Design a binder for this molecule. Structure first.
Ligand SMILES: CC(=O)c1c(C)c2cnc(Nc3ccc(N4CCNCC4)cn3)nc2n(C2CCCC2)c1=O
Length: 260
């Protein structure tokens, strides 16, 4: 659009490239824009232009949709990735991990309550403002490291998909490196079960291509996620529960003694 001007390139990918641009009309503020190169997809934008009306403090603001499209949003300074890349030793402060995780679950509880699933939650799209405020981005239409077991298996794809990704990002917050760094669904699933263990046959998805009988003893987490309290250990384990039905929800997670 002519109401905006491209200065730099934020990110590239299959979904299309997003750019940092100057919103000349609105006091030359920095805005993030992404193009698109038509009936059941009308909903996607109707849910976002609606989600917008609640202006949740932990989700990127949308500014406009122009025409073949141009999507303008709020520009955030950096992501969680480059945030972790610059934090001095011995990593992120206990309280900084606990705070940023709250803002993450709030934005997740907001999206879930409004029947929205992120589906691709990674540090690359968990943005962080100058003030240090978490903003969820890259939703309302690679790296399997954050993919949930059931997505990998191709069974369910419901809201517990993001609670796995959050336990993966919660670990990476301490560790400062991906917990499960697989290279294929089968490799990912593997590396996952090498840590959490083989779940009971009762929790394995009934009727899927990959059987339980194709993989492991449960390993303690304090080994892989170094200096984490028994409370954070309790929360992250509930986040990383094989059975999506047993996996904690952002709403019960927002309650947990870890934030008390
Ligand atoms: C489509 C989006 O929701 C969206 C928005 C609105 C956005 C806003 N500010 C960003 N701000 C950032 C975040 C990081 C950078 N750097 C990119 C170059 N390397 C250093 C970090 C620059 N700007 N980045 C944004 N993204 C990126 C997240 C991952 C994919 C693109 C987005 O998807």
């Amino acid at each position: 659009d002519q109401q905006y001007e491209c200065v730099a390139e934020i990110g590239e990918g299959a979904y299309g490239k997003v750019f940092k641009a100057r919103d000349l009309k609105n006091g030359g503020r920095f805005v993030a824009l992404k193009r698109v190169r038509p009936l059941s997809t009308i909903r996607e934008v109707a849910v976002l232009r609606h989600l917008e009306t609640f202006e949740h403090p932990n989700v990127v603001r949308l500014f406009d949709v122009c025409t073949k499209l141009t999507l303008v949003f709020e520009h955030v300074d950096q992501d969680l990735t480059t945030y972790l890349d610059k934090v001095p030793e011995p990593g992120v402060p206990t309280e900084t991990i606990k705070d940023m995780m709250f803002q993450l679950l709030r934005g997740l509880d907001f999206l879930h309550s409004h029947r929205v699933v992120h589906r691709d939650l990674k540090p690359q799209n968990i943005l962080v403002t100058s003030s240090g405020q978490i903003k969820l981005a890259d939703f309302g239409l690679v790296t399997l490291w954050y993919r949930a077991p059931e997505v990998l298996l191709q069974s369910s794809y419901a809201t517990p998909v993001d609670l796995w990704s959050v336990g993966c990002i919660f670990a990476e917050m301490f560790r400062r490196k991906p917990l499960f760094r697989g290279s294929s669904d089968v490799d990912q699933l593997g590396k996952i079960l090498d840590v959490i263990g083989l779940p009971g046959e009762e929790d394995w998805p009934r009727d899927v291509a990959l059987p339980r009988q194709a993989f492991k003893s449960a390993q303690p987490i304090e080994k892989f996620v170094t200096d984490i309290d028994e409370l954070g250990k309790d929360l992250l384990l509930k986040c990383l529960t094989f059975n999506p039905a047993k996996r904690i929800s952002a709403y019960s997670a927002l309650s947990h003694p870890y934030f008390q």
